[PDB]
Amino acid sequence: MVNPTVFFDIAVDGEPLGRVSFELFADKVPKTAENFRALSTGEKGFGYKGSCFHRIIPGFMCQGGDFTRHNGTGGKSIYGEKFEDENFILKHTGPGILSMANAGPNTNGSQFFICTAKTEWLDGKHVVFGKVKEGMNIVEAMERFGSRNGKTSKKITIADCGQLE
Numbered sequence: 001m002v003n004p005t006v007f008f009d010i011a012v013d014g015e016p017l018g019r020v021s022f023e024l025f026a027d028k029v030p031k032t033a034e035n036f037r038a039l040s041t042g043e044k045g046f047g048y049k050g051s052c053f054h055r056i057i058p059g060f061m062c063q064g065g066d067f068t069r070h071n072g073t074g075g076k077s078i079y080g081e082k083f084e085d086e087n088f089i090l091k092h093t094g095p096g097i098l099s100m101a102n103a104g105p106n107t108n109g110s111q112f113f114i115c116t117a118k119t120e121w122l123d124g125k126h127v128v129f130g131k132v133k134e135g136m137n138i139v140e141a142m143e144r145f146g147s148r149n150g151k152t153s154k155k156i157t158i159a160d161c162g163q164l165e
């Protein structure tokens with residue numbers, strides 16, 4: 001087929017950091033890939049633009065996607081509020097993996113995370129659906145504004161986002 005590609009233009013307290021692009025595995029997880037793709041373009045009237053990465057843990061991951069409450073408690077999918085775990089075919093093999101954040105089985109909304117390391121303990125618990133294609137240096141830069149518990153030292157936001165391919 002043709003896995004779509006989306007981008008995020010990251011900012012720190014408004015100051016431009018850089019662009020990160022992701023390939024979405026629509027071929028393996030079509031429903032999960034579509035949710036992220038649609039939220040990246042904002043076609044449903046809501047999405048990632050303007051939202052922040054509320055939890056960043058060095059050597060672990062960068063979490064974001066809460067465009068409703070903006071603190072890790074909200075966010076919503078394009079299929080209503082929450083949707084089921086599609087499948088656990090793909091694993092958290094290393095840095096760059098794009099996966100779904102959740103509050104337990106079948107509670108996928110809009111929140112997601114970018115791994116900065118292999119996180120195999122999350123395999124079978126979080127739906128992996130994409131991977132960073134370009135701008136891993138920017139993800140590594142974001143990681144420097146995080147902390148051990150996850151609280152960020154500065155506001156890391158998605159200044160702009162959309163579809164590339």
Ligand SMILES: CC(=O)N1CCC[C@@H](C)C1
Binds near residue numbers: 102
């Ligand atoms: C609860 C949840 O979805 N997440 C995202 C992945 C890393 C976890 C510590 C938190």
